[PDB]
Structure formats: structure tokens, C-alpha cells
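Job type: complex structure
Entries:
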Amino acid sequence: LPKSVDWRKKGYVTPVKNQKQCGSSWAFSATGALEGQMFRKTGKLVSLSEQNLVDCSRPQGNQGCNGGFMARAFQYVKENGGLDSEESYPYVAVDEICKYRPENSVAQDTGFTVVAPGKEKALMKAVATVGPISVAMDAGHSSFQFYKSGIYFEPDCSSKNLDHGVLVVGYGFEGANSQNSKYWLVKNSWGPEWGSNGYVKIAKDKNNHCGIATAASYPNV
Amino acid sequence: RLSAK
Ligand SMILES: [Cl-]
């Protein structure tokens, strides 16, 4: 397994998006993993529609702007046989009527792969060999809100009670000792302006910090 | 969750 990975440097990640005031981080995380998988398969990077997901996956268990889950989203992409691009189905940040139009589909998944819960090495492994991995984390902390740079480590973080889905686009370390001060390169959906260009480095191999490895998964394309 | 902002 490599010492560091950064899928953004390989063209698998779209520019940072903003979920605004709507609880769809789970949709952002889902579209991130999908955009990366579709890229690996076709060599084309296409921004996917989170709005598609907000409005149409209530049957799979999602709740549009009030929460949802990444695997439930992959689940919907599969039952539905498709997912529209952002350009054809724009994000408006509010629960609206499902207007999925298959002529505008640009992605597909036949299911998904899960990572054993709490297993950071399984996660590192999925990251290194597949591409960006959708993950859930506990982001209920002011320190996260105000995060600007470096490795984020918050003592009151939970590894069990999560409220936010993000995307692990890679991992690495700080310094020269590959085995220490490691972090997960995480893509957020609070705009380019939050954190470090919209990303956050989160303590790695520090007991499943903030639950990043608790319920990770990626779509099968 | 949503940004505090
Ligand atoms: Cl959310």
C-alpha cells in the first residue's frame, strides 16, 4: 500500500461544492464517490446531481434535506438504473419534486462495497486501490466548523454517533516519518471557502477518529 | 450536517 495517495492529482475529483442549508452532505459524499468511480471507468469527470438524490431517494430511506445515507444513495442509483449530471439537474438546496430524466443519465452503479466498520486499514486499503471512498463522521464541533489547516484532532469526537457524510479522496502524513502524524485527506461540501480549500486533513490511525472508518463504502460501477 | 455559517 502506498504511503500517501491523493486522488485529486489524478483527476478523480470534482471542484468542492456547497450543500448550503440543507442536510444533504450524504448526497455530496455519494456523488463524490460516484464521480470518482465513473472517472476510473471512462476517463471523463462529470459532476453528478446531488439534487437528483435529494428529491428521488426517499424510497431507499433518504430524507432529502433532513438527512440520508450514502449507501442508500448508491442503492437508489442502482434501482433507478441511473443518475443525472449536475448541469441537467441543478442543486437548489431544498427538497423538491423528483425530476429524474434518464436521457440525462451519466452514471450507473450495480451496487456497492462496504468497508468493515472501524477498520482504518481496510479503509486505507479501499482508498489506495479504488479511488475516493464515501465516509460518515461526527462533525458536530465548533472546532470543525472553524477548521483552517493541519491535522484535525478533536477530543470530543465520536466514532459511533455520526452526523455528516464526507469523502476521503486520499491520505498521507506530515513530515518525513511515514508512520506518524498521518491523516485522511477529506473533501467536504461546505464550499471552497471552508477549511483548507474545502478540504480537511483528519487524524489517521488514531483509533477511528471521528468515526471516519465506521461506515465507509463506495459504488460498484 | 450544515455549515454553522
Ligand atoms: Cl447534512
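Summary: Residues A 23-25, 164; B 1-2 surround chloride ion (CB under 6 Å). Chain B touches chain A at residues 1-5 (CB under 8 Å).
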